């Protein structure tokens with residue numbers, strides 16, 4: 001559709017999930033959003049905000065437990081660096097098979113995997129320089145017990161895979177790209193609840209008011225949600241919000257039309 005409309009959206013109005021299998025490149029996305037050609041870019045500022053928020057949630061607040069399931073990880077691992085200090089076991093999941101290939105290369109420490117070292121050092125500094133980068137990466141690698149296929153739009157997001165009830169379900173920068181509408185968004189929060197213990201933690205971080213995002217020239221849909229619609233959907237899905245933060249920092253105009261980002265910690269009712 002020549003960029004007139006997002007990829008895989010001509011017929012339905014929103015990028016169909018199989019576009020994440022046929023027309024999606026994790027390496028290109030990683031280079032664009034997590035490897036920086038210049039300092040103090042909007043992408044770098046957003047990543048530092050996410051990292052300080054994850055550090056605050058997992059290391060300063062009471063978000064601790066046995067199992068954490070990361071839903072819609074993408075090809076990234078920055079969102080698990082601080083979580084590995086408070087959770088014994090981490091299960092990482094994604095819809096995209098090429099994202100899963102990217103995570104398994106990182107898990108094996110394959111030379112062809114994306115290099116997360118500068119981000120790891122950054123988290124080590126936040127945490128008090130208790131350890132250096134390599135010791136921090138090895139701890140996270142040992143904490144990641146399973147790499148699974150997921151689909152937030154299904155009532156059993158992880159299929160037949162058996163798992164104990166989780167203490168936390170984390171989802172960063174996934175739901176705006178996976179849910180075509182507010183009813184799907186609410187159903188997806190309910191589907192995630194099925195993986196969670198009663199009183200378990202739900203941690204969500206995503207963009208606000210974004211109808212699309214770019215990976216170079218490739219455009220993908222995003223559910224344009226404001227902060228009120230996110231709170232109403234989280235409350236309707238069966239959770240009580242403990243804290244909710246909105247930041248005005250947005251991605252570069254050539255990468256997305258978001259109007260900030262939100263972070264929330266909720267508990268299953």
Ligand SMILES: Cc1nn(C[C@](C)(O)C(=O)N2CCN(c3cccc4cnccc34)CC2)cc1-c1ccccc1
Pocket residue numbers: 016017020029033071072073074075094095096099150151152153173174175176177178207210212213222251256258
């Ligand atoms: C930055 C940024 N990074 N990303 C994450 C990214 C590249 O979209 C991704 O790899 N994802 C999430 C979607 N995901 C999925 C897609 C279809 C269905 C899924 C069913 N279950 C689970 C996951 C599903 C597959 C992994 C989004 C932004 C961003 C978003 C809005 C505005 C501005 C920036």
